[PDB]
């Protein structure tokens, strides 16, 4: 029903989910930058 | 400084824990009675039909009651799905009932649950950080 | 699992807007609708044949 | 005035001197400037005799300063006549030389730890050998008892099928043995709930056999004088040493 | 289940101690209550219609 | 630079979520009713056999 | 369920050694002895 | 299940064609087989038994 | 079905296992080296 | 900020604040001039002439 309504009101979704994934990818790196600055212990990847 | 902060967090965690244990005992006491009443209702509904239809009454009349009981059970399993919005499984319902009773008692005693579950996280994070500081591979 | 992995407590769920009463008020009218359409088909079958 | 960044952006709800519109302003914390936010504030309204932001000691702040630099402290917001006092919701070389020292040291320390971790790995695998020999035989003798339950359930499923098979067709009618064969199903449902309420477990077969397996295994080892708290301690320590040794190479 | 990722052995699952008679003695007296509640209801309702 | 990068990605989200929440509200409006309709098919079959 | 995390294919799912010949030698004669013992149990109850 | 861990949206699930019809294309021709062969079984055992 | 199919078609499951392992291992090791926070390649 | 701003950003900002300003120069305790790419934390070590 969400894809049917998105086609109904002409919603671009590949823009939207990638716009969310970029925010989550930025939040992952902001999470990993908290550790070596304010803890002074080595980064993990 | 880290080993001094962790004892401070345990000191903050200490005194509010006992009333949480007592609310957990209250929620367990209110959930265990329901979990045994679930068996007590079936033990009642067994003997409702068993005394009648074997040697008191006829089977050709209790069987229309029997199929509609077994279909009302199939409707009651779907009504819980409509309300709770999950699947009715036996260990996914008693945990809901115990959590709901715990948050019911958490206003009758009003012990700052929102402070407590927030306090339980920073102690775990510093607990992991004190482990990672003493990593035996790299010298610290 | 009720105690989460950090040791804290899972949040309280929702109840939805007098749910028992509207489940009760949606299961009782359609029972009479079912016996109405049973009466309608039982009249139609015997009258038509 | 109100400073709320619950929407992700600090929105300020301001009205004008001697006017009526309580307008909300959404702006950036770090990439926006004061002297260009005041441009957007002044392009719409009409009372632009004075629009400014001062320090609370009367010092004018710069135009090109940032928004995050301003809202970290208090300020006067000054439009033409009045004042809006705003209150918002509120060793570095010794660590570097430690990071510089630990580069010159771990090159030796990993080879130091390696040829002793190999010894700790070896002396526990020497210990493992007789307790493994006892554990495998205890595990097999519990395994046969576990297998016999899996076959005995099917044996009951076969005996019940025959005792329902014969006496519904011969010597007793179906019409009297149908209420006999309904209550075995209902009593099986009650027993499936009773196994849940008695052992705290959903009644599923690959978990039911592993519930019976530990009840068999721990008692069958305790009857044979077996220290399981040695055997799992060794498997803890050897796996600990293995996950330590994997961290060396990659 | 028994395979812990280190290779160890799980601790013993806690049985409910003296819960067998607790199950049986919530089955049987409620069974007799649901038994006795049936006879004195149908004979009470059919003789008044 | 990453918090400045996240700034623009949060700025761009605000207009596009409006149509998203609208279509989500409008599509859940059929899912709730088809849940109650799936209850209705079970409800009428208990009636027609009585 | 078909591949691993990396796309590698799972190893051989084991079937036990001729287990149908083992289970079918348990299903039928138990189905026969449970058929026959019901007569023995019915006989004394018919006598009482 | 509905949304992603990142807050994104799961894409459209694929829909196998004639799914309204392919189930009946096997049910309807093979209900006839069980309809016919048990009548034939009765006509066969009517003579022997 | 896949195991007896790959037996009667005689190609390798072992190479297609061991090598597809190294595909993901090399890609993980390359992603852990193009990490934009852990600067190696300017 | 001492981590991002430079001398050439601070004097450009001071030039942007006014219009009557026409010549700016951060000198040293000595007579020499500090360029327009020096970090601020390399400027605030000592006293300076503006």
Curated annotation (Swiss-Prot), chain F:
Q: Which residues form a coiled coil?
A: 1-22
Which residue ranges traverse the bilayer? Answer: 33-50
The compartments listed are: Mitochondrion inner membrane
Q: PTM comment for this protein?
A: Phosphorylation by CaMK2 in heart leads to increased MCU current. The regulation of MCU by CaMK2 is however subject to discussion: another group was unable to reproduce these results. Phosphorylated on tyrosines by PTK2B/PYK2, promoting oligomerization.
What causes induction of this gene?
MCU transcripts are down-regulated by microRNA miR-25. Down-regulation by miR-25 may protect cardiomyocytes against oxidative damage in cardiomyocytes.
Q: Which family does it belong to?
A: Belongs to the MCU (TC 1.A.77) family.
Question: What does the protein in this record do?
Answer: Channel-forming and calcium-conducting subunit of the mitochondrial inner membrane calcium uniporter complex (uniplex), which mediates calcium uptake into the mitochondrial matrix. MCU channel activity is regulated by the calcium-sensor subunits of the uniplex MICU1 and MICU2 (or MICU3). Mitochondrial calcium homeostasis plays key roles in cellular physiology and regulates ATP production, cytoplasmic calcium signals and activation of cell death pathways. Involved in buffering the amplitude of systolic calcium rises in cardiomyocytes.
What's the domain remark here?
A: The selectivity filter, in which calcium ions are arranged in single file, is composed of two acidic rings separated by one helical turn along the central axis of the channel pore. The N-terminal MCU domain is required for efficient Ca(2+) uptake and for interaction with MCUR1. It is not required for targeting to the mitochondria, oligomerization, interaction with MICU1 and MICU2, or assembly of the uniplex complex.
Q: How does it assemble?
A: Homotetramer. Component of the uniplex complex, composed of MCU, EMRE/SMDT1, MICU1 and MICU2 (or MICU3) in a 4:4:1:1 stoichiometry. Interacts with CCDC109B/MCUB; this inhibits channel activity. Interacts with MCUR1. Interactions with MICU1 and MCUR1 are mutually exclusive. Interacts with SLC25A23.
**Name of the featured protein:** Calcium uniporter protein, mitochondrial
Organism of derivation: Homo sapiens (Human)
UniProt gene name: MCU
Residue numbers of the full-length protein present here: 202 to 251 of 351
UniProtKB/Swiss-Prot annotation, chain G:
State the span of motif (GXXXX[G/A/S]): 34-38
> Which superkingdom does the taxonomy of this entry point to?
Eukaryota
Outcome of substituting residue 36 to W: Promotes association with MCU, protecting SMDT1/EMRE from degradation by AFG3L2 and SP7
Record annotation: effect of changing residue 38 to W: Abolishes calcium uptake into mitochondria. Promotes association with MCU, protecting SMDT1/EMRE from degradation by AFG3L2 and SP7
PTM per UniProt?
Undergoes proteolytic degradation in neurons: degraded by AFG3L2 and SPG7 before SMDT1/EMRE assembly with the uniporter complex, limiting the availability of SMDT1/EMRE for MCU assembly and promoting efficient assembly of gatekeeper subunits with MCU.
Q: Which residues lie on this side of the membrane: Mitochondrial matrix?
A: 7-18
What does the UniProt function comment say about this protein?
A: Essential regulatory subunit of the mitochondrial calcium uniporter complex (uniplex), a complex that mediates calcium uptake into mitochondria. Required to bridge the calcium-sensing proteins MICU1 with the calcium-conducting subunit MCU. Acts by mediating activation of MCU and retention of MICU1 to the MCU pore, in order to ensure tight regulation of the uniplex complex and appropriate responses to intracellular calcium signaling.
* Family note: Belongs to the SMDT1/EMRE family.
Query: Its quaternary structure?
Result: Component of the uniplex complex, composed of MCU, EMRE/SMDT1, MICU1 and MICU2 (or MICU3) in a 4:4:1:1 stoichiometry. The number of EMRE/SMDT1 molecules is hovewer variable, ranging from 1 to 4 copies per uniplex complex, leading to uniplex complexes with distinct gatekeeping profiles. Interacts (via its C-terminal poly-Asp tail) with MCUR1; the interaction is direct. Unprocessed form interacts (via transit peptide) with MAIP1.
UniProt name for this protein: Essential MCU regulator, mitochondrial
Biological source species: Homo sapiens (Human)
As recorded in Swiss-Prot or TrEMBL, the protein's gene is named SMDT1
């Amino acid at each position: 029903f969400f894809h049917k309504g998105a086609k109904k009101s002409r919603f671009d979704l590949e823009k939207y989910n990638q716009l969310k994934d970029a925010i989550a990818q930025a939040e992952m790196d902001l999470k990993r930058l908290r550790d070596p600055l304010q803890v002074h212990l080595p980064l993990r990847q | 400084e880290l080993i001094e902060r962790l004892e401070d967090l345990k000191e903050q965690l200490a005194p509010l824990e006992k009333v949480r244990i007592e609310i957990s005992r209250k929620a367990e006491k209110r959930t265990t009675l329901v979990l045994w009443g679930g068996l007590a209702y079936m033990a009642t509904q067994f003997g409702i039909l068993a005394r009648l239809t074997w040697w008191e009454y006829s089977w050709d009349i209790m069987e229309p009651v029997t199929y509609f009981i077994t279909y009302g059970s199939a409707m009651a399993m779907y009504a819980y799905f409509v309300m709770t919005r999950q699947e009715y499984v036996y260990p996914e319902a008693r945990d809901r009932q115990y959590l709901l009773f715990f948050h019911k008692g958490a206003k009758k005693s009003r012990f700052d649950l929102e402070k407590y579950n927030q306090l339980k996280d920073a102690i775990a994070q510093a607990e992991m950080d004190l482990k990672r500081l003493r990593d035996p591979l790299q010298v610290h | 699992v009720i105690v989460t992995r950090s040791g804290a407590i899972l949040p309280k769920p929702v109840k939805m807007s007098f749910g028992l009463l509207r489940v009760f008020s949606i299961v009782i009218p359609f029972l009479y609708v079912g016996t109405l359409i049973s009466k309608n088909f039982a009249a139609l079958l015997e009258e038509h044949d | 005035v109100t400073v709320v960044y619950q929407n992700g952006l600090p929105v300020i709800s301001v009205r004008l001197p001697s006017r009526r519109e309580r307008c909300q302003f959404t702006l950036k914390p770090i990439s926006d400037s004061v002297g260009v936010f005041l441009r957007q504030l002044q392009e719409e309204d009409r009372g632009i005799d004075r629009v400014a932001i001062y320090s609370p000691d009367g010092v004018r702040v710069a135009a090109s300063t940032g928004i995050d630099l301003l809202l970290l402290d208090d300020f006067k917001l000054v439009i033409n006549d009045l004042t809006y006092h705003v209150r918002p919701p509120k060793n570095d070389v010794k660590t570097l030389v430690q990071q510089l020292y630990t580069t010159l040291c771990i090159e030796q320390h990993q080879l130091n730890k390696e040829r002793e971790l190999i010894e700790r790995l070896e002396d526990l695998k020497e210990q493992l050998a007789p307790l493994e020999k006892v554990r495998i035989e205890i595990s097999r003798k519990a395994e046969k008892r576990t297998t016999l339950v899996l076959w005995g359930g099917l044996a009951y499923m076969a005996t019940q099928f025959g005792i329902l098979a014969r006496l519904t067709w011969w010597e007793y009618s179906w019409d009297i043995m149908e209420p006999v064969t309904y209550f075995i199903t209902y009593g099986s449902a009650m027993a499936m709930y009773a196994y849940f309420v008695m052992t705290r477990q959903e009644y599923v077969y690959p978990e039911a056999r592993d519930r019976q397996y530990l009840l068999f295994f721990h008692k069958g080892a305790k009857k044979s004088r077996f220290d399981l708290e040695k055997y799992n301690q060794l498997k803890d320590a050897i796996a600990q040493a293995e996950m330590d040794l994997k961290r060396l190479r990659d």
